[PDB]
Every structure is written in C-alpha cells, then in structure tokens.
Design a protein around this ligand. Sequence first.
Ligand SMILES: [Mg+2]
Ligand SMILES: [Mg+2]
Ligand SMILES: [Mg+2]
Ligand SMILES: [Mg+2]
Ligand SMILES: [Mg+2]
Ligand SMILES: [Mg+2]
Ligand SMILES: [Mg+2]
Ligand SMILES: [Mg+2]
Ligand SMILES: [Mg+2]
Ligand SMILES: [Mg+2]
Ligand SMILES: [Mg+2]
Ligand SMILES: [Mg+2]
Ligand SMILES: [Mg+2]
Ligand SMILES: [Mg+2]
Ligand SMILES: [Mg+2]
Ligand SMILES: [Mg+2]
Ligand SMILES: [Mg+2]
Ligand SMILES: [Mg+2]
Ligand SMILES: [Mg+2]
Ligand SMILES: [Mg+2]
Ligand SMILES: [Mg+2]
Ligand SMILES: [Mg+2]
Ligand SMILES: [Mg+2]
Ligand SMILES: [Mg+2]
Ligand SMILES: [Mg+2]
Ligand SMILES: [Mg+2]
Ligand SMILES: [Mg+2]
Ligand SMILES: [Mg+2]
Ligand SMILES: [Mg+2]
Ligand SMILES: [Mg+2]
Ligand SMILES: [Mg+2]
Ligand SMILES: [Mg+2]
Ligand SMILES: [Mg+2]
Ligand SMILES: [Mg+2]
Ligand SMILES: [Mg+2]
Ligand SMILES: [Mg+2]
Ligand SMILES: [Mg+2]
Ligand SMILES: [Mg+2]
Ligand SMILES: [Mg+2]
Ligand SMILES: [Mg+2]
Ligand SMILES: [Mg+2]
Ligand SMILES: [Mg+2]
Ligand SMILES: [Mg+2]
Ligand SMILES: [Zn+2]
Lengths: 84, 117, 23, 69, 69, 181
Amino acid sequence: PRSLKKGVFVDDHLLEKVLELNAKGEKRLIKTWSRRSTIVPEMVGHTIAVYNGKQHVPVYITENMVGHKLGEFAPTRTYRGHGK
Amino acid sequence: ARIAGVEIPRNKRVDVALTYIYGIGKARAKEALEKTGINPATRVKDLTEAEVVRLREYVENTWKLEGELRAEVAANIKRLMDIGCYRGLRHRRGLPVRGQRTRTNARTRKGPRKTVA
Amino acid sequence: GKGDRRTRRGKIWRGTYGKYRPR
Amino acid sequence: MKEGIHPKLVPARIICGCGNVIETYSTKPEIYVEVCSKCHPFYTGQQRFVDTEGRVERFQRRYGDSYRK
Amino acid sequence: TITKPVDVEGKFIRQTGGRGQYGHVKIKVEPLPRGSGFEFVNAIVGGVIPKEYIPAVQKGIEEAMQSGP
Amino acid sequence: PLDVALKRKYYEEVRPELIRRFGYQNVWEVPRLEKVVINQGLGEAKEDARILEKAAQELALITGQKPAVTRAKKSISNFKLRKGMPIGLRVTLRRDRMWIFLEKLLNVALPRIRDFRGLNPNSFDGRGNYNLGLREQLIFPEITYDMVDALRGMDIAVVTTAETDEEARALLELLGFPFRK
RNA sequence: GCGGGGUGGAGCAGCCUGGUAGCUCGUCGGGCUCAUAACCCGAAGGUCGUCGGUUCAAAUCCGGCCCCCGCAACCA
RNA sequence: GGCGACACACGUGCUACAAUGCCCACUACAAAGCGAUGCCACCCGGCAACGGGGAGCUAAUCGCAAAAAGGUGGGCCCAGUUCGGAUUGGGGUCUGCAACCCGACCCCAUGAAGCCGGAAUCGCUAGUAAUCGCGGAUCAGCCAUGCCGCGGUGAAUACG
RNA sequence: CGCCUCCUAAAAGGUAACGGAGGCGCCCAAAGGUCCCCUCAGGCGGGACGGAAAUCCGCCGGAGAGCGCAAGGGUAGAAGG
Ligand SMILES: [Mg+2]
Ligand SMILES: [Mg+2]
Ligand SMILES: [Mg+2]
Ligand SMILES: [Mg+2]
Ligand SMILES: [Mg+2]
Ligand SMILES: [Mg+2]
Ligand SMILES: [Mg+2]
Ligand SMILES: [Mg+2]
Ligand SMILES: [Mg+2]
Ligand SMILES: [Mg+2]
Ligand SMILES: [Mg+2]
Ligand SMILES: [Mg+2]
Ligand SMILES: [Mg+2]
Ligand SMILES: [Mg+2]
Ligand SMILES: [Mg+2]
Ligand SMILES: [Mg+2]
Ligand SMILES: [Mg+2]
Ligand SMILES: [Mg+2]
Ligand SMILES: [Mg+2]
Ligand SMILES: [Mg+2]
Ligand SMILES: [Mg+2]
Ligand SMILES: [Mg+2]
Ligand SMILES: [Mg+2]
Ligand SMILES: [Mg+2]
Ligand SMILES: [Mg+2]
Ligand SMILES: [Mg+2]
Ligand SMILES: [Mg+2]
Ligand SMILES: [Mg+2]
Ligand SMILES: [Mg+2]
Ligand SMILES: [Mg+2]
Ligand SMILES: [Mg+2]
Ligand SMILES: [Mg+2]
Ligand SMILES: [Mg+2]
Ligand SMILES: [Mg+2]
Ligand SMILES: [Mg+2]
Ligand SMILES: [Mg+2]
Ligand SMILES: [Mg+2]
Ligand SMILES: [Mg+2]
Ligand SMILES: [Mg+2]
Ligand SMILES: [Mg+2]
Ligand SMILES: [Mg+2]
Ligand SMILES: [Mg+2]
Ligand SMILES: [Mg+2]
Ligand SMILES: [Zn+2]
C-alpha cells in the first residue's frame, strides 16, 4: 500500500464530482476512468461507472467498501471456466 | 487444553511450546517470557502453576488467538468475498490473491493436479 | 532457509536488512 | 444403587485458575481447572478480553480529512 | 442444407511409421438465410494450424459440399 | 439426600422467581427437573475394536454412575451394522447424582468448552425438555489429557416437568444455563 | 416350444458359492525417436439390459418385461 | 485495459526435504567493479522497512562495504521439527501523477507440499565439478531465482 | 407327477380342468420346559460426529410391527422382546 506521509489519493476530477452532487441534487451516473481512486466516505451510497477497458461497470457503494479502489469492483479478465 | 485453548508439549522449550498455539509466533514467544518473567530455557514439565497462570493469563488477555482469530480471519475473507472485490473473488474461485501468475504453478491455492485428456 | 525472510540467512540472500538482520 | 460397579462419589473440591473455588462432589476429591464460570468471558458480563475490535472496519479509518475542496 | 447450427470435429490422423497423415480441424456450421451463399471464416488463432494448410482445408469443406446427406 | 449447591439454589432462589413470572396456583405446577440422560451416541465400536469400556469409565467418572450398553436394533448394511452390535452407552442421572453432575457441568465444564459462545436457545423440545450435544470429553473436570485415547462426544438429554419451552427456558436459565441469544 | 445369453470403447472373466468388479486390446498423460510405429512408466472410463420382489446387503438369488444366439417345430 | 488469464502439458531455474544440519551471539580472510537532481559516513527516532539530519568524495583519498562459507562457544536431539518457507489475515516503508489489475521491502500471525523423486535424462577431467558470498549492465521502482562478471573453500575418477 | 397356502369353491364339508398365483424336501440345544419382567411399526419435535434410517430424550401412535422360510389364520389380556 501507499505511504501514509502523502494523503490518500483521489483523482480530484472525481472528488469534485462526488461533492458537487452532495449540494445540488443527488444523483446521476458518473462515468469514470479513474480506477486508481480510493473510495472516499463521501462516495457511499453512490453509483459510479468503472470502465474495464471496454464497458462501464455500474458500482453502487457501501460502508464496508472504503479503502478499496474502484478498480477492485470491475474486473477486466472475463473468465467463466475451463473445459466446460 | 491448558494455555490457551490447546495443551502444549512438555519436554520442549516454552519459546516454541508457546508457538504451538495459533496466533503466537516466535516473537510473541519472545515478548511473553520477559513480560511475565519466566526463563525460556525451562521445559513445560519443569514449571510451577504460578509460572503457569501468569503466562496463561497474560497470553490469553493480550492478543486474540485460536477460534476467534480464525473467526475474524474468515470474517475478513467473508467481507472481501461479500462486496465483492477482486481480492475476494480470488477466494471464491480459490486462485492466488496476491496477483501471482497461474499458467504454471499456483498448486497450493489450486491443490492436486487435474490432468486433462 | 534462503527463502526464509525471518532469518539472517534468508535475508542475506535477498540482500535486505531488518530485525532479523540488523546493520 | 448397585454395589461394586459404581465409582464412589465423594466431597470434592474443584479449584479454578482465577482463584475461584467450587464445592461440589466428584470421584476425585481435589481437581484443578483452566477457566470457569466466574472467569469465562461469556460468563463474565461483557469481558471482550482484547477485542471490542470491532466494526473499526470501515471508515473509522479516516486519516484524515486531508483532501482539498 | 441444415436446420440447426452444430459444432463438430474431423480427425484425420494415421501415425504408424513415418508415412505421415495429420489433419485436424474443429468447426461450427450454421444455416444461413436462404439464398445467401457459402460463407467461410478463417477464425484460426495464430498459426495453430499453419497458413499453408488453409487453402486446401476450404477446398475440402467446399469439395464435400457437392453432395448432401 | 445431601446438600449440593445447585440443588439448594433450585428450591430457595429459582422456584420463587418462576412462581413470580408465571404464577402457579399449586406447588407442583412449577417446573422440576425430572432426569438427565447421557448418551454416547457412538458406533465407533462397530466392527472396530468392539470393546470400548474405556468409554464407560469416561462416563463413570463424570457421573459416578456406570452406564448401560446400547445394541443395534435393526441390522444395517451401510452402517456396517449387525443387529445386537454394541453401538453405544447410556447413563440415566436422577436426584443428587443428577444435581451433582449438572452442577459441575454448568460451573466448570461448559466454559472449558473451546470457542463457547453459549448453548443453543432453540434446542427446546416443544414439550419442555432440552438437548445439548457435546463434541468431546476433556470438557469435564475429572477427565484429563492423560486418560484419553480418542475424542468421544455425547448427547445430553435434559428432562423437565415443564409443559412449554417458555417455562423450560426460564428454569434452565435461572439455574445458570448460558444461552447465546 | 426347449436351452444359453446381455458387465468400462472391443473381446472376455466375476454369477454357480450375496458383501469385495478382474484379463488382453483400446483411450488418455508422460517417456524414446528427426519423426512415426514398436516398446517403457503412469492414469482415467462400467456404475453390471431394464422394471419389481428377497435380503441388513443383489452384477450375483427369484418374478415380469425388451433384445440376441442355439435347437425344435414330427405322423400331417 | 491487456501482454502477469488457468482445466491443463513441456523446457529453464531457485528454494528445500535436514544433524556434514538449522537458529542466536562473539570474531576473522577476497577480488572486480560502480558512484555529482550519484555513492552515502556517523549521530539520532522507529523491533524494522525507511525517515529527519549531516561529514567526506568529480573519488588507489570519502563511500557502497557486512563479503559469505569458515573460526570460538552456547541452544534445539531426529520429530513434518527450532527442517521447510509456499499460502493467506492485519499493519506498515519507499519509488513514482498513480501499485485494483500489477510493484519491491519490512514486521506481526498463518507454518502447505516436500522424508531424496516412475520411465527417462544433463553437466563436469583440476583450481574444474560442488558449494559460499560479491559486483555490474538495464534501472524511477521492480516481479532477477535471469544474465554477464568476481574472488573464498575445494574434491572424485579415467582400466579401457 | 408327492406335500403346504390362497383363489376358483356357488356363506357347513367336499368339489375339476395342460385354471390364476406362491412355497416345501429344511431348521433351532434353544428358536425347547417353566417362572419373572417388558411392548411394537410409523409419524412429528429435540440431540456431537450421525446421513431418510446406528444410538438418546420427549409427545402422538390397538396394532399397520414382530411371530426363522410361502401363504393364510391367529396373536400385545402375547404366540412378540
Ligand atoms: Mg505459531
Ligand atoms: Mg509475484
Ligand atoms: Mg544450501
Ligand atoms: Mg525456519
Ligand atoms: Mg473532507
Ligand atoms: Mg507404406
Ligand atoms: Mg425448538
Ligand atoms: Mg416435559
Ligand atoms: Mg413359450
Ligand atoms: Mg461387453
Ligand atoms: Mg462360473
Ligand atoms: Mg460369489
Ligand atoms: Mg502413450
Ligand atoms: Mg532436417
Ligand atoms: Mg511413438
Ligand atoms: Mg435389492
Ligand atoms: Mg431379469
Ligand atoms: Mg434348424
Ligand atoms: Mg416319424
Ligand atoms: Mg499493462
Ligand atoms: Mg511475457
Ligand atoms: Mg507441520
Ligand atoms: Mg505430508
Ligand atoms: Mg518449522
Ligand atoms: Mg497483507
Ligand atoms: Mg501495481
Ligand atoms: Mg528423517
Ligand atoms: Mg540434499
Ligand atoms: Mg576438455
Ligand atoms: Mg546478484
Ligand atoms: Mg528462476
Ligand atoms: Mg367352501
Ligand atoms: Mg356351499
Ligand atoms: Mg367330514
Ligand atoms: Mg385342479
Ligand atoms: Mg419359534
Ligand atoms: Mg417361542
Ligand atoms: Mg427361558
Ligand atoms: Mg419410534
Ligand atoms: Mg430427527
Ligand atoms: Mg464418531
Ligand atoms: Mg403383522
Ligand atoms: Mg421367503
Ligand atoms: Zn476461575
């Protein structure tokens, strides 16, 4: 994990999008590409669309998933199984 | 089942006998013999119930072990599974979590080899 | 144990220091 | 009961570790014990021993409010 | 012409002394909207079957089409 | 009989609480314990090492009561089972012996259970009685590590003159049965 | 009508004598070879034609039902 | 985002299965190379990874730097172990916009297979094989157990 | 092809056919005498391993169990254990 010296990381072009809905009118569909962003407590209860290289994965956010990034919730390898 | 939930081997030294318990590596066996004041070189068979209760009381009250440990462990894995994140998706299936390569190897997370015709 | 990071020996091999190999 | 097939029961004393003393009966007039009902962490109110862990997972994590607006 | 898409195998392997003969091809075949024509997709990945053995693996699917079942 | 701690507790502390909660117009309407049956469900002595009266001294030190044998009713193929096969032990505890044993089982043994989160508050008969299943046997004070050879659990039948589980909960409760929920 | 039969992909044991499925080929993985056969190491595949009964237990004993071989079908 | 996929098969290796060993402390003996938004003494904080300091050096000058095996003594006593370190939980440290994919390191807990390998098969004839550490290219960091080098200890056998 | 059970068999008995269906050619030294005691199958609920079904506890359950083997009759107020 990252170094605690620097603040935890959020793209700021997204945290801007998280808070601006908190005041105007929650909520619509935030199409994101920043898989790198740690989930901020201000996101909870939102639906954000993590891209996987091809498509926008709907990700509804809850209070047990915070430290984890938006990337953990939209895999890229599509698998199914082997030998079926 | 003396200390903690599991009775420890006599004849062997206590800085390893105490490691014969889930949750207690050599270093927790390092620190639990200065803090309760007992010689590491003495055997479980060469103690006194004074030396027994001090240790048992200390060891059980400090960190969490045994079932509760495993419980929280599974709990942490169950959460990682629940959401569910990739980290926890690799527990569902049962492949490596810490991003290994799978093409070859990984036989520890995958078990005995299912040779295919 | 050259793979045992919890030894002087397993730490030498990887070329790192720690509690288990102090400098 | 039936003669000479039963383990006689005598005034026994079971001592626990936490200093607790039970006076019941047994086949062994004196017995020592790990944990019991005066010390066991289910039996003792709410002693969580070490773990009021608890639901620190999650966002107690904070550390901190260090992102600009 | 057919009335349900199938997926089938064709194993022409005769190995008993140098003499040779190895020809292996698994395919999907489906019924087109009538009047269509003969459609042939080289969906071979890489060189799993070499490039040179594909002209004459159409000429074998194509040839045997001259007589239905 | 003789003075034993849980027995005195029944008469002079538990009873009257009960009479409060449920109001009985007769002193016999008020829940008693009838008996406590221990059964080593067993079957580890089928075609294997048939004679385990090492189990029957286990039981006999716990209760001070030699148990009795149980034999296979119908013979059964899949259980490797020949009718009249010894497949277990049963000891029936009543009165002082019952009190003495139940006493030691609440005061020491049930806590000596690893990972104990409390007895199941759902194993009630629907008709007043309660049943617990113990998974091994070092649980009991008079049983050491240096006596064992195998881990045998056992089934505990707790039998009561209660008519409902409501009054069965209460009664066992008041005597100190630790229920998880 | 009388007899025998039906079990891994093929061919054959086990059935009589209830318990536990075996042999040779073939298949598959690995080996040797430039390669292929041969050969060497290793492995998987029946759930015993079906339905019913006996039994604690049925490929096995008993009944019916589908199928296949052999013999009979004469004085007329 | 992928080249890091995983039902599987092959090649090349590393680390092991232990007592000629493994762990902890005490103490020795190399070479070749590298180093100015680079090497980093020593002092201090932290069990540590590292961080805040801060001296020297365009370096037969100061430094990376301890070489390691080995030597002295002490502990474990043949066990899936004080052998083994894979896997997993939690916490961290640094590089870098950013470590979910997908980094390396630290420490805490976990402590799997593996008891010397079927058919088959490689290397080496002397400072070689075996074994032990060191450096360098690349390089922000690093998935290097790879590669190209360097020295320590140091064999066996060749009738034919 | 002899023997046992059922049906045909027309409510005593008996009653045929190359009529419909089974079974016997044994067994048990206790599976015999007697005394004493005990009551089943099945259903629901509860109980470590333990499953539909091993053993344990509860409640319901007149007999559907059991009675070595076919079937019938009989049978717990026992012929059952
Ligand atoms: Mg441990
Ligand atoms: Mg990796
Ligand atoms: Mg080595
Ligand atoms: Mg080790
Ligand atoms: Mg804020
Ligand atoms: Mg030819
Ligand atoms: Mg209930
Ligand atoms: Mg009752
Ligand atoms: Mg005929
Ligand atoms: Mg056949
Ligand atoms: Mg025969
Ligand atoms: Mg036979
Ligand atoms: Mg082969
Ligand atoms: Mg050529
Ligand atoms: Mg060949
Ligand atoms: Mg049957
Ligand atoms: Mg038949
Ligand atoms: Mg003829
Ligand atoms: Mg004639
Ligand atoms: Mg990529
Ligand atoms: Mg690649
Ligand atoms: Mg082990
Ligand atoms: Mg093993
Ligand atoms: Mg170990
Ligand atoms: Mg971790
Ligand atoms: Mg990464
Ligand atoms: Mg050995
Ligand atoms: Mg070796
Ligand atoms: Mg030469
Ligand atoms: Mg190197
Ligand atoms: Mg390698
Ligand atoms: Mg008549
Ligand atoms: Mg008449
Ligand atoms: Mg007459
Ligand atoms: Mg007749
Ligand atoms: Mg009889
Ligand atoms: Mg009789
Ligand atoms: Mg008699
Ligand atoms: Mg019943
Ligand atoms: Mg039940
Ligand atoms: Mg068992
Ligand atoms: Mg009957
Ligand atoms: Mg019969
Ligand atoms: Zn106590």
